[PDB]
Subunit: 144 residues, 3 copies
């Protein structure tokens, strides 16, 4: 009886706080995922660290819509973004950080291809991907 | 049994996040309404768009307290604010965006009055209102 | 049946908003406490006011971990922080704002000591404390 009311007020309040964050441009909601960046441009590992420290994970799009969302953040900060995936042993193949193998992909024509073992994946401001070193300075985007 | 505890922790956490946003000056709470602006000064339609895109609606005070809250944001950013209301067909009469007719009002002495059909409503930094064109650049304030 | 799902989505959402705030560096979570500052440097009373106005209270560490958390904020803004405690009648003794007597302490060697009745407590960027006047300009840190 009380529950119903409380759940309502709680939901309203969460929507309000998320509404404020969205309006401030501090986050992007896409389905159940929330993307956000603190505007910093660091290398891969550094990014992984920050995201996990905030309670999240380095972003990785698993659908065209998620991909576009990250691309808009890349565009907004005019910088490339490191994605949550790395090249397996057998070149040309990449996997999600946990271990699963990349499902959705948006490689720029001709990619993946490059000199290097265990390469990272950066996203161009147009959304397409490119594989390369993990020591560049990329916009740190996280997903929660 | 578990519920009671969880609801408590959830409420605490929401209060914390709202407390942080309030302290940062990112929002103002007045009753069940939360007001917020991203500091941008755009015309009416533009404002409507932004607010709805964030999951909210262009602000509209329905009580002296709500009115003052928006006025403080107008004062803080030293800019006038477009309110969520527009002039009906029969001049001098305004309605809430949905359709209902404006209830609470705080017109500046002598207002409303002006050359124009379907005019917008701006709030002066002192809180009083004035009706005029919808193409000026006003502080975008939303309510959630 | 529905509850279980809703509680889950609600928890997820709260974690997301807190994750965004953490990533933006707007807050620090330590156990059930959340610390945050709006970067302002004001005197004691002023600080008390701001925190309560935001729905919180001037920060006070009650454990080494809380202490370090506030110290990191002090370090980040390169400014000393006023803590939530004041000297009792009998010099050398301090109490929490409510009234309870200070439990955890991290005085800088030789402290507390100084000319003054009812003194405040500032935290050095290294985390140790020092008692002195309440009219200095210190970083306003709140806990929620
Ligand atoms: Ca490549
Ligand atoms: Ca007028
Ligand atoms: Ca002293």
């Amino acid at each position: 009886e009380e529950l119903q009311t409380e759940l309502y007020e709680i939901k309203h309040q969460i929507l309000q706080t998320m509404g404020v964050l969205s309006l401030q441009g501090s986050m992007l909601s896409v389905g159940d995922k929330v993307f956000s960046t603190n505007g910093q441009s660091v290398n891969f590992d550094t990014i992984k660290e920050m995201c996990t420290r905030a309670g999240g994970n380095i972003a990785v799009p698993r659908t065209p819509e998620e991909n576009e969302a990250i691309a808009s953040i890349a565009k907004k900060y005019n910088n490339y973004v490191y994605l949550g995936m790395i090249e397996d042993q057998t070149p040309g193949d990449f996997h999600y950080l946990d271990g699963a193998s990349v499902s959705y992909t948006n490689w720029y024509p001709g990619e993946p291809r490059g000199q290097g073992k265990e390469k990272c994946v950066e996203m161009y401001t147009d959304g397409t991907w490119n594989d390369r070193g993990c020591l560049q300075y990329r916009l740190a985007v996280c997903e929660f």
